Design a protein around this ligand. Structure first.
Ligand SMILES: CCCCCCCC(=O)OC[C@H](COP(=O)(O)O[C@@H]1[C@H](O)[C@H](O)[C@@H](OP(=O)(O)O)[C@H](OP(=O)(O)O)[C@H]1O)OC(=O)CCCCCCC
Ligand SMILES: CCCCCCCCCCCC(=O)OC[C@H](COP(=O)(O)OCC[N+](C)(C)C)OC(=O)CCCCCCCCCCC
Ligand SMILES: CC(C)CCC[C@@H](C)[C@H]1CC[C@H]2[C@@H]3CC=C4C[C@@H](O)CC[C@]4(C)[C@H]3CC[C@]12C
Ligand SMILES: *[C@@H]1O[C@H](CO)[C@@H](O)[C@H](O)[C@H]1NC(C)=O
Lengths: 804, 86
């Protein structure tokens, strides 16, 4: 490699004195000098077409001084101008002013800031520089690489390219000089001797930018083939022949209105062939659901996919939307925690209660946020887990078995099961769960959530019926022992009000009122604003009773006389039998299928391609974390949790940034879920705050989440299309490429599946819901092609919403 | 004699339709649209409507074919200048 320096004749700003200033330099890669005074990022040299066209024109009639016995810029310029005149390239009257320009002071980057900067100058017959007349074009290299020396080998020789504009010239002129011996000149401050000198002088002319001309000449000198030819050329024609080969192997890229990487990489064979042609004459030679067949391969790839994004997973949470999402998901995960913990304490005789669920949710959420590959999932108790708890309690009480110790052994089996599943990459079976099962499960879960919220409101009405007369002296501890006036109606009013305010602020976010950023902010905090408004409304009505949030008194076991914080696997009061230590696998099996299906389907729904998640989702790490944490928590008398669908979907939706109707990005970070888990753990100490929050406001919030979670489900959209006329139907591939009655038959089969699952959930055999849900995969993969074409299935059951 | 359309030839995939316009129709640029029941309007295309010297019922009807070509189709005209005697 050699050093090439390009200097341009410019005039300064303080004394208006013309001089030479370095504009770029080359050590193979090209560096450019910005107006600030610093060198830009080094880059591969790209040339304009006009610079190479003009460089070939001046080089054809150029002036060559090969093996010239001079060791000074004054000596070179005297000989160069003497043969310029002999070649009739400049007139003898021009020699005096051109020699004055060449032997001027050559400034460098160390004096750009010391001076007032430089502006382009054109030499005149008079000494004072003329202001350029042609329209100025700012250098593309400066705009693209500059607005923000040890590589030189000891034996290397340098090349100086000088470009300048003089109005008193007929045509641009090229002077090429190869010194007999490489000498040090005052123009170059670097301690590298100069062998070659490019001099490019001429008038202002169209299609000629002398900075680009110098860049082309310096790039040509920086090329290895031409430089070897330049060292061995004893005539102008040999340099001309090398230039022609340089242009023969050049690749011109025409303008296009649709640039792309793939179209550009289609020229890789062309670039390789052109480089091969150039060096053929010179003596130089040219210098997440896949199965890998490896143990724990999915887990390692899951870690490597997401863990590099850990720094972004903290910094991306510095937005008010994340805080609003924290306030949302805190209530959305705390109220189900309290309700399920109360039901657990009522059923299990307080062996497992509210405090255990709260602490388990907090610890598991903190660990999942810190270590999970998809931190947008919310980990907490769910309905099927409660049903399993009641079933196992009934079984343990039937055969005189301790319930919590059986839970310990079930978790011990769960750890082994999840280790075996992860070690064999068993999470790749998730790829057989297409949009069919995912959307059926999501729609069923949202419908169940809405139905349960309405059932809670109905139960409030039954507990406090509307009647002509009421008992006024009723006992108020620990809950209403009788009907109360204005209670059910106020609960209805609060629920409707908070739902209405949440929906109004959601429409305000997408509305065109107020400053948009303020509207976006206000809209982000829409659910907290509605919650605060209705909490204040109930606060200012003091006479009426409304049921409030109740948290445990402290961080103590829910039943002090039954168990401690740690459970002995051999038994608490009686010896645990040997046969149940082995028989706990089957209930552990059922729990594993429940948790696996719920968590992996939730991960599939949340991490859909249409949701615009670029940080990746791990199906092996999250399952291992959730099931192992549940198995460990079983040893501490704590519930095993799962990645719930509604809470995770709401959490992802609250972090989604909408474009200007179209998903733009999601704030994928680890801080929001961590703060929700920490607040759930701290909720015991926040009793004076939570005790003034009514359950009706949270019921309206639940209704909002239920109606919101249906936005991205194509099954819900097609069910709407059932009530919607075909002409109205949207421009989507399953409408435009599938017949309307075929689409409705597809929707009706999905509806029949939903009805079957709802019926199954209504029976005591509701723990078989995972298996019946699994049965929808053989449906789509076998029976659906027996009545639907492949085109229809591709359009309707599309992974990324594609038109086949 | 008014706006009308009839299918003349038809295969399983296409209809050959003969479309009439009234002899006293408004001239100018027209849009042709097709309405199918249960469907929104569809623009078939655009056409320009002109006076018709070839049609008996038109107000610009010319009796003679030679007169029709001379006075409407011939783009190569002659303007007579000079004087009456030259
Ligand atoms: C709450 C403010 C109190 C009013 C104080 C009175 C002062 C006051 O707020 O008005 C002047 C000011 C004008 O400033 P300006 O027009 O530059 O501000 C535009 C406004 O922020 C829009 O919401 C933005 O659109 P989007 O939504 O981001 O897409 C738009 O950006 P863009 O996208 O077009 O490039 C912004 O340019 O605001 C209004 O726009 C009028 C609405 C008045 C707001 C009145 C609301 C009651
Ligand atoms: C968007 C927000 C929600 C909107 C929907 C409104 C639903 C309100 C709940 C009604 C059903 C219900 O709960 O009624 C059921 C209750 C309870 O009957 P019971 O015999 O005591 O129960 C028997 C069970 N025991 C034996 C345990 C007690 O009936 C009533 O007390 C009758 C009064 C109903 C008042 C309806 C309010 C106005 C609703 C219309 C508003 C547009
Ligand atoms: C996957 C997990 C649950 C391990 C499977 C459980 C079986 C294989 C093992 C694990 C721990 C074992 C127990 C460990 C220690 C003893 C004490 C000894 O005096 C009697 C047998 C007994 C009680 C063992 C019985 C078998 C046992 C219960
Ligand atoms: C706690 O357990 C004891 C004995 O096991 C039982 O008698 C009591 O009812 C339990 N407490 C509650 C609140 O259920």
């Amino acid at each position: 490699k050699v050093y090439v320096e390009l200097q341009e004749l410019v005039m300064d700003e303080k004394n208006q004195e013309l001089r030479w200033m370095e504009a770029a330099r080359w050590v193979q890669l090209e560096e450019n000098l910005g107006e600030n005074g610093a060198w830009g990022r080094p880059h591969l040299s790209h040339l304009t077409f006009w610079s190479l066209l003009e460089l070939r024109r001046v080089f054809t009639k150029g002036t060559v001084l090969l093996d010239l016995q001079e060791t000074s810029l004054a000596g070179v310029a005297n000989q160069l101008l003497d043969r310029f005149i002999f070649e009739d390239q400049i007139r003898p009257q021009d020699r005096e002013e051109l020699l004055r320009a060449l032997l001027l002071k050559h400034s460098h980057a160390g004096e750009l800031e010391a001076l007032g900067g430089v502006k382009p100058a054109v030499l005149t017959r008079s000494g004072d520089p003329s202001q350029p007349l042609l329209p100025q074009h700012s250098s593309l290299e400066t705009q693209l690489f500059c607005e923000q020396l040890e590589k030189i080998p000891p034996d290397s020789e340098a090349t100086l390219v000088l470009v300048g504009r003089a109005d008193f010239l007929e045509q641009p002129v090229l002077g090429f000089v190869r010194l007999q011996e490489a000498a040090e000149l005052e123009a170059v401050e670097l301690p590298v001797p100069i062998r070659f000198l490019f001099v490019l002088l001429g008038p202002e002319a169209p299609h000629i930018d002398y900075t680009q001309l110098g860049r082309a000449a310096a790039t040509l000198m920086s090329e290895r083939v031409f430089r070897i030819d330049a060292y061995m050329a004893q005539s102008r024609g040999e340099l001309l022949h090398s230039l022609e080969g340089f242009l023969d192997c050049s690749l011109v890229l025409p303008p296009t209105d649709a640039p792309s990487e793939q179209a550009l990489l289609s020229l890789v064979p062309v670039q390789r062939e052109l480089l091969r042609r150039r060096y053929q004459s010179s003596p130089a030679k040219p210098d997440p659901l896949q199965q890998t067949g490896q143990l724990f391969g999915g887990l390692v790839r899951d870690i490597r996919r997401r863990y590099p994004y850990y720094l972004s997973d903290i910094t991306d949470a510095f937005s008010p939307q994340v805080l609003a999402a924290v306030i949302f998901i805190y209530f959305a995960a705390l109220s189900p925690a309290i309700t399920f913990g109360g039901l657990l304490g009522e059923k299990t005789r307080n062996q497992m209660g509210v405090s255990e669920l709260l602490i388990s949710t907090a610890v598991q959420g903190i660990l999942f946020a810190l270590l999970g590959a998809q931190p947008l999932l919310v980990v907490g108790f769910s309905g099927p887990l409660l049903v399993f708890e009641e079933a196992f309690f009934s079984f343990c009480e039937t055969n005189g078995l301790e319930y919590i110790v059986g839970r310990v052994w079930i978790g011990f089996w769960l750890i082994l099961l999840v280790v075996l599943v992860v070690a064999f990459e068993g999470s790749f079976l998730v790829r057989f769960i297409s949009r069919y099962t995912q959307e059926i499960f999501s729609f069923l879960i949202s419908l169940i959530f809405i139905y349960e919220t309405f059932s809670k409101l109905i139960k409030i009405f039954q507990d406090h019926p509307l009647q002509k007369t009421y008992n006024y002296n009723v006992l108020m501890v620990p809950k209403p022992q009788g009907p109360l006036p204005n209670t059910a109606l106020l609960s209805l009013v609060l629920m409707a009000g908070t739902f209405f305010f949440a929906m109004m602020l959601r429409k305000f976010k997408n509305s065109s009122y107020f400053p948009g950023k303020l509207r976006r902010v206000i809209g982000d905090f829409g659910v907290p604003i509605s919650i605060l408004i209705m909490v204040l409304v109930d606060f200012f009505i003091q006479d009426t009773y409304t049921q409030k949030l109740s948290v445990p008194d402290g961080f103590k076991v829910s039943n002090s006389s039954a168990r401690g914080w740690v459970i002995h696997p051999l038994g608490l009061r009686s010896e645990f039998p040997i046969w149940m230590m082995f028989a706990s696998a089957l209930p552990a099996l059922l729990v594993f299928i429940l948790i696996f299906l719920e968590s992996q389907i939730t991960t599939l729904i949340v991490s859909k391609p249409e949701r615009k998640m670029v940080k990746g989702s791990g199906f092996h790490l999250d399952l291992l974390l959730v099931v192992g944490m549940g198995g460990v928590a079983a040893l501490f008398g704590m519930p095993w949790l799962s990645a719930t669908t509604v809470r995770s979907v709401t959490h992802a939706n609250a972090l989604t940034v909408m474009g200007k109707a179209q998903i733009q990005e999601v704030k994928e970070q680890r801080i929001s879920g961590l703060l929700v888990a920490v607040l759930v753990g701290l909720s015991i100490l926040m009793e004076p705050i939570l005790s003034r929050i009514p359950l009706a406001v949270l019921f309206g919030i639940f209704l909002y989440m239920g109606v919101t979670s249906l936005s991205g489900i194509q099954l819900f959209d097609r069910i709407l299309l059932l009530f919607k006329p075909p002409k109205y139907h949207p421009d989507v591939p399953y409408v435009k490429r599938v017949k309307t009655w075929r689409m409705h038959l597809f929707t009706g089969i999905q509806i029949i599946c939903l009805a079957v699952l709802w019926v199954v959930k209504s029976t005591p055999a509701s723990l078989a819901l995972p298996f019946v849900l699994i049965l929808t995969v053989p449906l789509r993969r076998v029976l659906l092609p027996l009545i639907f074409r492949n085109v229809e299935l591709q359009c309707l059951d599309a992974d990324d919403a594609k038109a086949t | 004699k008014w706006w009308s359309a009839v299918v003349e030839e038809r295969d399983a995939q296409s209809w050959t339709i003969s479309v009439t316009t009234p002899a006293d129709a408004v001239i100018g640029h027209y849009s042709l649209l097709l309405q199918v029941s249960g469907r929104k309007q569809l623009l078939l295309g655009q056409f320009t409507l002109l006076f018709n010297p070839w049609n008996r019922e038109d107000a610009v009807f010319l009796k003679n074919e030679a007169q029709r070509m001379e006075y409407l189709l011939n783009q190569n005209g002659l303007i007579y200048l000079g004087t009456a005697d030259c």
